[PDB]
Amino acid sequence: MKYLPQQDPQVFAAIEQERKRQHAKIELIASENFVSRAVMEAQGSVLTNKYAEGYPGRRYYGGCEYVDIVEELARERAKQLFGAEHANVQPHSGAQANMAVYFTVLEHGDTVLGMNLSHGGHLTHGSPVNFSGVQYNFVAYGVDPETHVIDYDDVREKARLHRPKLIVAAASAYPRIIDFAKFREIADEVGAYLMVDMAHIAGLVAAGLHPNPVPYAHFVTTTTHKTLRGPRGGMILCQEQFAKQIDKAIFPGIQGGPLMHVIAAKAVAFGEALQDDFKAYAKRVVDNAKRLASALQNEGFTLVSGGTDNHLLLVDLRPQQLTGKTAEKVLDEVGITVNKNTIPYDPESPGVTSGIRIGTAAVTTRGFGLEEMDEIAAIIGLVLKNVGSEQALEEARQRVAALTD
Amino acid sequence: MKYLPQQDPQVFAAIEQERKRQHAKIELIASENFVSRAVMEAQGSVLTNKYAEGYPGRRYYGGCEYVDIVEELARERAKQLFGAEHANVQPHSGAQANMAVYFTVLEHGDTVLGMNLSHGGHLTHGSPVNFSGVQYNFVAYGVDPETHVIDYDDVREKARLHRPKLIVAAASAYPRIIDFAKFREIADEVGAYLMVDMAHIAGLVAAGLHPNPVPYAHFVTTTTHKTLRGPRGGMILCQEQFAKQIDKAIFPGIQGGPLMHVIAAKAVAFGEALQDDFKAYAKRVVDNAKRLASALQNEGFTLVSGGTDNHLLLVDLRPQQLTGKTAEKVLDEVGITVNKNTIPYDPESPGVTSGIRIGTAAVTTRGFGLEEMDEIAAIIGLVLKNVGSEQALEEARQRVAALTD
Fold first, then answer.
1. Same domain membership, residue A217 and residue A142
2. Domain count of the fold of chain B
3. Do A18 and B272 make contact, defined as CB atoms within 8 angstroms?
4. Which of A142, A402, B38, B372 is the most buried (most CB within 10 A)?
């Protein structure tokens, strides 16, 4: 940076602290990643100056010839990545992407069937304090109490009982592959639309390491950040039959002017994901997650579903008689960033929890591999087995520092 | 840029075209501006990498110590700028800011009273194709057919007849000062909340050149872009009594993770607005608008309301027997960017219109002054009086080029 340090010392000092923090800590929050310098440059461009309500070639302001090229690059690259018939790259966030799909097919009070929030479903999949649960009548399907895998017979029973207009598949804390074919079969049986929210797994889908929901879902929503490793924002994919309605849902439905600089950054991120080296990256993400899971089990930890098929895992801390809150706190003391997370059938409140959620996308981006996964697991074991020992925590602190340099 | 040109030639080439376009053209779209290099740098920072759901000191993820400093700088500087008791700097856009306020105080189907959309009201103030008009029962007040000033007796009558739960004041195309005191008096009479959407005029309010709605409104929404000259995004100001509810409306109500890099940019823009030179800038904006209005009238144009009190003006093209669409098109041919805009009591459809909307915020930022306003008016006269003369358009083209270099 050249101008910010002189113009705004206060803001610059805080940004620099954050930059140094991002290097120093071991980032295991499953939704986190580190974008490329090219992505950041695109976000830091003069494109922020342009109003471009509408769509490429169909804008409500003149002078959009070049931002049109940018938006079309984003849309076409997205279609290439996911094999979707249509892309909308304007959603401001994952929340807004979901909001738009709901706005498209649902009326106020319509019934929607989503994943139980305490079993891995997202806030926007029906929380009573979120617009989703307030505007629509959400019902939930669960995971099996033993295997922690989605109970597809429960999905089916809930669908047949409640007759939802829409079924939502996908999760913020589900460590196994989701069977989109079965979701569509159930949807077809009850005459419901199927929406898949692939936010967490989008990068893995792009790399062919998780089955693609696009062929099975009427609508696919996603964040552009997370495993896709793009800028912060949302996206909708859908078949051509819903393209016009989806576009109208985003604008003039729920948003105004799009963030053209962020859309530029989306294009850049999609370009990166199209490359062979992103596929290798995504494989290392999944390989690292498996290794970390196995190494944690070797340290004596119990994992929800007994492991992982993707980028993330959930530790069930009940055998250690620890809450997620306690674990999150003490790991923060040593420079490991996780979040407390409700486990399926958690006896604890969402404010306390019995689990921690861990993902490997960020550390993989930093170049961590199998050996590092072993060490992270060993440090986590050292910490959580010795929460009352300042010397153990100091050793952990030093070992964390050794990993990040 | 260093990395984008090598990583993504296609995206870079388009961005460079856009950058050159922004310099070459005379930007008169009233919502447009040019942000500082410091603002762009903040948006292009590593802060995009951080999940920070929640609020400063009350986040749902660890490691937010530094982004907390950034968000608090934004909130405190906003409070300083506008004298508000509370600020929420997380809204992704003006649309989302408005959405959140509606979510806070209204239930589905509640009656809201806003400015007639064809008289200057915004899309999010009740368009039947926008969530606002779909989710709530919007009724409208109008401007006087002669003076084109808001008819406050009509505001009062509509309020007393329809008994709205909420009254919205503010506009996307209203060239005169809005009387917030009268709006609050009417609101008090019918027991309605008052929301002021100051998006267009926020920079002028900050500079003391338009009366401040904060003392009179329960809620004030705004964009951070437009006359405020900040990054693309939204903000809500309110009294302390609504702070908790407003914050909950934004999250977990309508959004997820905030855009921390954009919030950094918001802080930077607010810092800039706090400086004496921004006040001088804003005065030049209003001075330029007055000069441009007078110069246009000298060229024989009729203006809606007979002039301007702010940054924007509306030309009523009926005396010239031209539509807004025709005028917008031919001005585009010579490098002047305006938008067609419905005028009050327009005999034409929104797709055609009888007016063009013009604002001076962008050209003022580029350093244009009174002499330049005279020349812009003269060029507009040359063009619109000679739409069929390629030689006149070429002369105009050359005079536009002379202004921008």
1. yes
2. 2
3. no
4. B38
